């Protein structure tokens, strides 16, 4: 209400969060940040600044936008 994390509203702030991002994740910080997701600093776990939705266990083939949309259909950012 309205945005869950206003400090992660900036795409640059989401990108900056992806320090120590694991090589095993197979999704880039730039793809994740463009879909409104920032790094929590744990495993491959990311969160949306807008809806507060959290996503983990990324697999090769996943698209950041599609996964965000599908699991968080009320999110205004990927609507």
């Amino acid at each position: 209400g309205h945005m869950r994390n206003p400090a992660m509203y900036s795409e640059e702030a989401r990108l900056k969060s992806f320090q120590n991002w694991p090589d095993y994740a197979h999704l880039t910080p730039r793809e994740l940040a463009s879909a409104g997701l920032y790094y929590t600093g744990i495993g491959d776990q990311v969160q949306c600044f807008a809806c507060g939705g959290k996503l983990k266990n990324w697999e090769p083939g996943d698209r950041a936008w599609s996964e965000h949309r599908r699991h968080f259909p009320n999110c205004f950012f990927v609507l």
Binding site: G53, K54, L55, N57, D62, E67, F72
Partner: peptide, 5 residues
């Protein structure tokens, strides 16, 4: 990806 809270 898996959603969680």
């Amino acid at each position: 990806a898996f959603p969680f809270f």
